[PDB]
A paper describes a structure:
To determine to which domain the 2-AI binds, recombinant N-terminal [name] ([name]-N) and C-terminal [name] ([name]-C) were generated and examined in the pulldown assay with the biotinylated 2-AI. Western blotting revealed that [name]-N and not [name]-C was captured by the biotinylated 2-AI (lanes 4 and 8), suggesting that the N terminus binds to this reverse amide 2-AI. To define the binding of [name]-N to 2B5, we attempted to solve the crystal structure of [name]-N in the presence of 2B5. We obtained diffractable crystals and determined the crystal structure of [name]-N using molecular replacement. [name]-N forms a dimer in the asymmetric unit. We also identified an unmodelled density surrounded by four negatively charged amino acids (Asp8, Asp9, Asp52, and Glu10) within the experimental structural map. To further investigate the binding, we docked 2B5 to [name]-N using AUTODOCK 4 and determined a binding energy of −4.98 kcal/mol. In the docking model, 2B5 is close to Asp9 (2.5 Å), Asp52 (2.6 Å), and Glu 10 (2.9 Å) of [name]-N, three of the negatively charged amino acids surrounding the undefined density shown in the experimental structure map. Further, we have demonstrated that the lead reverse amide 2-AI binds to the N-terminal signal receiver domain of [name]. This binding may inhibit the formation of the active [name] homodimer, which occurs at the N-terminal domain.
Residue numbers in the entry:
A (entry chain A), B (entry chain B): 1 to 121
Write the structure that this text describes.
Amino acid sequence: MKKILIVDDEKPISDIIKFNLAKEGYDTITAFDGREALSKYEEENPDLIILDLMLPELDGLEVAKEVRKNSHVPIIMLSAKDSEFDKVIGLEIGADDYVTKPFSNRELLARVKAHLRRTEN
Amino acid sequence: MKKILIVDDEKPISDIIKFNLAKEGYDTITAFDGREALSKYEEENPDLIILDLMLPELDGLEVAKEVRKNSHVPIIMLSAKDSEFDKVIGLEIGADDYVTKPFSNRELLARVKAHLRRTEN
């Protein structure tokens, strides 16, 4: 199975993503801070990271940069900041996608599927 | 350089995307209906397709379906339909991204870069 790393500080959001991804047959691991995200990414090799922008310790931009030091694993950024600026900055840093909260669970699921399917190709 | 196929029946929209992509160093080719899109996609081999959903002759889902028979070339779908349903359908058929109209040009550009950058990896 494909393993999704879900990093978000707010546990109710993380549980909804985890539950929906589990329904679809994904393995899921969670991190609730930027530092925890980076250690979980190195130790467990997720196939995709869902990455909140506002995290403890290290924010999502910083996490994304460290990941991109070493890998091309797809990154879908989540953000309450729905500015045009923030979306461009996330993508240029190395996000493969940028989704604002509130978001649709099905849309995120299909975005997860779409980016995992590219990795195959 | 990279070649972007821009398929939108509405020439003002197409011109703004052509202009912004050309400014960023991209080569650009255009189509204005689904049939013309498929012939240009076949004969000119774009590195990325920006694909309007509301097309005459055949709509963007059909274009995407046809293209996907033979290539994994990235497709960024554009749509005035801002519904969760239409976003998921486009992604499931094989769109790599789905962006609603009206859109930010820097954001679309950033998404163009992000999906071309994935192909290079």
